[PDB]
Amino acid sequence: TIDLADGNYVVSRGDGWILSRQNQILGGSVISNGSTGIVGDLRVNDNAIPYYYPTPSFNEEYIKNNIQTVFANFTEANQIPIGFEFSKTAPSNKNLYMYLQYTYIRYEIIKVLQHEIIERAVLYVPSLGYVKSIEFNPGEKINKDFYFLTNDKCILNEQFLYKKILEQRVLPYSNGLYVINKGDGYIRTNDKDLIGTLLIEAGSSGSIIQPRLRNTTRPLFTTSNDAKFSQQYTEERLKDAFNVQLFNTSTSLFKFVEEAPSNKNICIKAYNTYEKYELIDYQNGSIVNKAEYYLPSLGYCEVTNAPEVVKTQVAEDGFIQNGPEEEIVVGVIDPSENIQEINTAISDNYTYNIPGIVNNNPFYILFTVNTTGIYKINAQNNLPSLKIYEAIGSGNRNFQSGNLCDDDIKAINYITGFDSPNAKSYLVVLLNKDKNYYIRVPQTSSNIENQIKFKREEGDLRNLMNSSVNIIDNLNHYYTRQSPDVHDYISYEFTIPNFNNKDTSNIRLYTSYNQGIGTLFRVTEYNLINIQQNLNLLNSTKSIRLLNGAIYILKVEVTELNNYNIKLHI
Amino acid sequence: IKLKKDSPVGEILTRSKYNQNSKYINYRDLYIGEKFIIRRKSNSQSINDDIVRKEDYIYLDFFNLNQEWRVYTYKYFKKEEEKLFLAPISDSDEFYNTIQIKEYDEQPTYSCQLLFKKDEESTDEIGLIGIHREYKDYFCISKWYLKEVKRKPYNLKLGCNWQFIPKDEGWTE
Amino acid sequence: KLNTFMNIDFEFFDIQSIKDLITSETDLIKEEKESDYNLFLFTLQEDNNK
Amino acid sequence: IYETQIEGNNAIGNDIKLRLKQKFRININDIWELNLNYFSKEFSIMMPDR
Amino acid sequence: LISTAIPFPYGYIGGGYYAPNMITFGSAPKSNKKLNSLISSTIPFPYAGY
């Protein structure tokens, strides 16, 4: 009496099955005259023994292996103790007797031939309990059906899940590692993470407890390139960003309690949950390596009102999110790149000679200032271009005036800079006292001794707060660079082509894809005087008359982002 | 000895052992670690003969990637021990780069000692190159060894005794 | 011809191994602590710390 | 037994758990190979050896 | 090693070294609408039962 085609099938009939001749095994409780009774149980290693009923075709191992591949791995789930409790209140001037029994999950394996099941193997997996109550006056005779069950029954809800046994977003992130928290509440499909179901009768209350009697827990890992993103590697980067210490253990308890009304019974289903972390490697506007790590969480609870067969096929393997939408992006230091430290706080002017130990390879310079202010950071001949990051939560705990306190923090936040190493530019950024900062020097090639120059620019240049000025020289025009995120500013400095304060020419400035409002300043050689304001660049046709031979700086924000790169015309 | 990944010092690791097929054979690899090289300091004597003689002044360089770095030492250190400073070839007033090779043991041996000197004509000894350990075994220069070598009889098990292994047709992986 | 044992196949005598087998750490310490000098001057210039 | 039942349990103090973890870090062969000859060399103490 | 090398402890009175039983304590007060009987703290009853 089956519709499926000839062949083998694995079937899950759902939780909430009670065996026969097992009703009053655990005993009962008696309340009276409004007394309140609570009966609970724990399932750890002895009341968690699965019951097999195989056939000559399907042995115990065959039944076990197939089911655990598609449904919850009961072998590793029965190892973790789980508790369940029930509560009933007797009415006034009456007595109440309530007895408890276990509930099992019924997994079948069948062989269909000519639209008729010709074989069946049945496995009962201990899941949770169930309480049956009755108000009895003394001396009354009860029906035997209440005490004795002579046939297995489905009480939670009829279910039938069958399996045949086959033989575009714009992300303006700079190049580097990132760890993204995609949210909590993830659960695997096909009830592969179901702690269990529990049926609370009318007027009663029920509860499911993870008492954490055992620290053991099961994370999950899925990489795209195990060469770089290993399991031990991803877990190390998580500790860098979010300071996650416990992966395979846990000491947090979670309970789920439901107090059903006096009209209808209710079903409460408890699943284990995971928090999803994504470790990516962003490069030139494209992910090249991604690893998903699912860390165990504190469960999820679903309440359903109990209500034919509705044969259904198992859902495709995957995850489902039940928690709120979340996306937290945190940069991380690449462990491969070395980390040089500057021990002396920068006061007003510093010259840094890049050590030879770097061996012409990219690395990080860790530094901090001796006094808050706006600083200009550049390099000899303004090449190569630099990137600057700010450590998250630095200079909050340990402070030593003058010297540097290396917090060893690796959760960095991008500020500004260009990943292109062939361009020439410098940075003007607002740095704060007692805050660790990183500068990522890229892979230089020339053996010529490079130098990093810091200056405390207290003049008109402060108008360029947190801006990567790019020296667009050689003008005599389509210059493209990495587009800053929304509300971030990028500046271009250029000298107009026999300066005599009289010769002048028309210049056209417009942005191909991204619209932004920018201002143009005229250099004094030092002092900047505004020459415009609120100059939209969304393919504007406006032209500005400027004297030849005068150095100007045009700073543009990012009003709206629609392309990874930013292109300027001159 | 293996050059540190980040710091300009040489970390001390443990030699590998044969674990391939046979329990009847056991040995530890030798062709591992940084490849060192002895360079004549003054190039005064004839270049025809390249054999190293006792009490010669030398540079103890080592190949890192395609470059040839040199072993230096701090000119002034308070504590008895001090980690060596492996860095590219250069000239500076903050480090000594002159090493003398000595053979203190009178009995036959293939070991040798390396001493740091301020200058060829200077009579002030800096210390002897060696390894010590509080775990964290380190490739250091110690002034203590200067005395231990003179305590007759010479202790062949000291940490200042060194031997050089070139590739030879008679030894294989 | 290969898997046959001659006398020399089970001769393990090594007079030096026996000598090193009856030598204890105490003997090594005594050898190290044995000296024929009541005074063996050692002089070092160091760095202004003669 | 310790690795499969003691480490996982979260209802027992660390005073016993951590000590047992370190107790089983060493191997029995280490204890069998531990004798006064090692401490004599370490401490440079002479003792009867035969 | 001497200090950490404690003798192995015997199992629970019932037997085994896996996990203790659970208990609940501290029933919450009767709220306006909900009885709150089951809202309580969970404890490992024989803590350090070893």
* Contact in structure between A8 and A164 (CB atoms under 8 Å): yes
CB spacing of E19 vs A209 below 8 angstroms: no
Nearest to D19 among E6, E17, E46 (CB): E6
CB distance A359–B87 less than 8 Å?
no
Q: How far apart are the first and last CA of chain D?
A: 42
Q: How many helices (H) and strands (E) does chain B have?
A: 1, 12
Sequence-distant contacts of D14-19: CB under 8 A, at least 24 apart: D16/E6, D16/E9, D16/E48, D16/E50, D19/E3, D19/E4, D19/E5, D19/E6
Instruction: Identify the three-state secondary structure at position D19.
Output: helix
Q: For residue B74, report the phi and psi dihedrals to the nearest 5 degrees.
A: -75, 135
Contact between chains at A209 and E37 (C-beta distance less than 8 A): no
8 Å CB contact between A314 and A338: no
| A359/B65 Cβ within 8 A | yes
Cα A490 from Cα A327, distance rounded (Å): 26
CB contact at 8 A, A98 and A37: yes
* Phi-psi sector, A552: left (phi>0), alpha (psi -120 to 50), beta: beta
At position B74, the amino acid (one-letter code) is Y
* Closest approach of D27 to chain E, Cα-based (Å): 12
Q: Do B6 and A339 touch (CB under 8 A)?
A: yes
Q: Please tell me the distance in Å from C16's CA to the nearest CA on chain D.
A: 19
**E30 contact A CB<8A:** no
**Residues 6 or more apart whose Cβ sits within 8 Å of residue A5:** A112
CA-wise closest residue to A64 among A79, A49, A75: A75
Whole-angstrom Cα distance, residue A532 to residue A530?
6
Q: Distance from CA of residue A362 to its chain's centroid? A: 29
Q: How was this structure determined?
A: cryo-EM
A94 CB-near residues (< 8 Å, 6+ apart): A32, A33, A135, A137
Task: Report the distance separating Cα A105 and Cα A196, nearest Å.
Answer: 9
User: Resolution for this model in angstroms, one decimal place?
Assistant: 2.9
Q: Does D14 touch chain E (CB under 8 A)?
A: no
CA A336 to CA A102: how far, in whole Å? 55
Contact residues, chain D, for E3 at CB < 8 Å:
19
Nearest CA to A189 out of A16, A278, A322, A324 is that of A322
Query: CA nearest B104: which of B164, B146, B58?
Result: B146
* Nearest by Cα to A66 from A102, A17, A111, A5: A111
Q: Give which of D11, B83, B36, E40 is closest to A257, Cα–Cα.
A: E40
- In this structure, what DSSP letter does residue A140 have? P
Helices (H), chain D: 14-23, 28-32, 36-43
The two three-digit tokens of residue A216, written as one number? 């053991």
Q: By the 8 A CB rule, do A519 and A555 touch?
A: yes
Q: Give the integer Cα–Cα distance in Å for B59 and B88.
A: 12
Give the C-alpha separation, C19 to B118, whole Å.
Answer: 46
Determine which helix (DSSP H) or strand (DSSP E) holds C16, and give its type and residue range: helix C15-21
Instruction: Residue window 1-50, chain D: list those with CB within 8 Å of chain A.
Output: 7-11
Q: How far apart are CA A80 and CA A215, in angstroms?
A: 9
Residue type at A217 in one-letter notation:
T
Give dist(CA A104, CA A14) in Å, integer: 9
Is the CB of residue C30 less than 8 Å from the CB of residue B109?
A: no
Question: In whole angstroms, what is the distance from residue B140 CA to residue B80 CA?
Answer: 10
Cβ of residue D1 closer than 8 Å to a chain E Cβ = yes
Looking at chain E, which residue has its C-alpha nearest residue D7?
Answer: E18
User: Which 8-state DSSP code applies to residue A492?
Assistant: E
CB atoms within 10 A of CB A461: 20
CA distance D8 to D20: 13
Among A284, A12, A260, residue whose Cα is nearest residue A174: A284
Specify the 3-state DSSP secondary structure of A75. Answer: helix
Q: Which residues pair with A330 in a beta bridge?
A: A179
A477 Cβ neighbours under 8 A, 6+ residues apart: A568, A569, A570
Closest CA relative to residue B36, chosen from B164, B172, B171: B164
Residue that is written with structure tokens 């039938």 in the block = A160
Cis peptide before A296 (omega within 30 of 0): no
Beta-sheet strands, E only, within A447-488: 451-455, 467-471, 478-482
Asked if B157 is an interface residue toward chain C (Cβ–Cβ < 8 A), one would say no
Whether the CB of D44 is below 8 Å from some CB of chain C: the reply is: yes
**How many whole angstroms separate alpha carbon A179 and alpha carbon A281?**
9
Query: For residue A309, how far is the Cα from the chain centroid?
Result: 38
Q: Do chains E and D touch (3 or more CB pairs under 8 A)?
A: yes
Q: Output the six-digit token pair for B35.
A: 């490849």
How would you class A534 by CB atoms within 10 Å of its CB: exposed for 0-12, middle for 13-18, buried for 19 or more? exposed
CB contact under 8 A, A357 and B65: no
List b or e across A409-431, with b for residues whose CB sees 16 or more CB atoms inside 10 angstroms.
Answer: bbbbebbbbbbbeebbbbbbbeb
Across the A:B interface, residue pairs with CB atoms under 8 Å apart total: 11
Tokens of A539: 């393919």
Closest CA to A542 of A517, A567, A513: A517
The C-alpha atoms of residue A414 and residue A265 are separated, in whole angstroms, by 54
Cis peptide, bond prior to residue A91, ω within 30 of zero:
no
- Tokens representing C8? 């020399």
Helix (H) or strand (E) holding A423: none
Query: C-alpha A81: how far from its chain's center?
Result: 28
Q: Tell me the residue type at A446.
A: S
Whether the CB-CB separation of B86 and B71 falls below 8 Å is answered with: yes
Question: CB-hemisphere CA count at 13 Å for A562?
Answer: 9
Tell me if A509 sits within 8 A of A544, measured CB to CB: yes
CA distance to A567, B48, B57, B68, B95, per residue, from B44 (Å): 63, 12, 11, 22, 23
Residues of D in contact with E2 (CB under 8 A): none
**Residues on chain D touching A44 (C-beta within 8 angstroms):** none
The type of residue at A313 is: Q
Give the residue among A306, A308, A302, A337 at the shortest CA–CA distance from A320: A302
Taking CA atoms, what residue in D is nearest to E50?
A: D12
CB B122 within 8 A of CB B115: no
Testing the interface with E: which of D1, D4, D7, D12 to mutate, by most E Cβ within 10 A? Answer: D12
Could you tell me which residues come within 8 angstroms of residue A325 by beta carbon, excluding any fewer than 6 positions away?
A183
B78 contact residues in C (CB cutoff 8 A):
none
